[PDB]
Amino acid sequence: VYADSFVIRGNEVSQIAPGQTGNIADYNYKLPDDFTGCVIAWNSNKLDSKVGGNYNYLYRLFRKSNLKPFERDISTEIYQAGNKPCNGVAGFNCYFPLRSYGFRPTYGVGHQPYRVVVLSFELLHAPATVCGPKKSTNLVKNKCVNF
Amino acid sequence: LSRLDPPEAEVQIDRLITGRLQSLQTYVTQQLIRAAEIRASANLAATKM
Amino acid sequence: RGWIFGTTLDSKTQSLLIVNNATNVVIKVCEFQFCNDPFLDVYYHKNNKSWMESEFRVYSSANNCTFEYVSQPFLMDLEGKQGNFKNLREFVFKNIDGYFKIYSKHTPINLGRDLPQGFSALEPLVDLPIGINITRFQTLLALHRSY
């Protein structure tokens, strides 16, 4: 079982779903179309926003192409948004990809930060490792049972 | 495909598949009986000749 | 000696460092800064001396790294006796939806034919859930002593 958690704005919770596309399911975190397991999301405005605004949370904005499901990209560079090549730093038609959220308690529902964690299982014919509270019993052979 | 996302397109395009499969099964079922009748007539014609 | 995978093989991107030795294997994906070259004695001759080991230091740095999977070594070298008897190692790697698979087996009989005919089927060995995208393949052959 794999549990990976991240903080997103409450507006984009619906984009964490199989088949959804947008500004967060195409450049940041994409899910497969045959996804098993499922998500959990709860509001966390109590401890994620300041009166002056929380600027510690980032999200990618520009990428060359959409990323395959279950992929990560922490690289930093300067986007080529024009004919003139961008050597580095900031310039016209040369954008920095990462941008900062601006969570504040004044904002209404839909702009306050949300705290989401997604679980992922798998059901394949492999030696099982984790499951719930069941008590094993004795084995019966050559008799009609309910195994 | 253009107007809906995959999670609902997968649900909607099943009804058309079932309907077309039924419409083709009916055609082959009728063709079998028609061929049987034609074969009986052909056997009668062969005997008559 | 193993294989190295990555999309750029530089500090800007993550990369794998699959490394195998006599009684261990080390699999760890890091943001490996530099991979200059395997250590070379410059002598490159072994008809007189048959001692060669302890090269190490293939990479330069690993700043923020995770996913350590030290485990049993991949390939077991069966004894080659009476000549004209070698084992043809087989491998295959796949990368779909953030899953890494490695299949392998040790097919014997390589008497006269470089790529023997017949038929053989590979068995699964290990699955790696790390993720990421790989678009470059490289080998870490140790040329400290060769013949």
Added chain:
Amino acid sequence: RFASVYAWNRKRISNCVADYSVLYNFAPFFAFKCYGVSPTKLNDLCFTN
């Protein structure tokens, strides 16, 4: 100023280039419930008005 429920006002939008992916910043709404077409593919179809 928004009109009352019993006297809602109608506005006609036509002859422009739409972009339905920017409405998320104008108003602090959450759902965007939409019936006929999936909200994801709003900026791909072409309408009359």
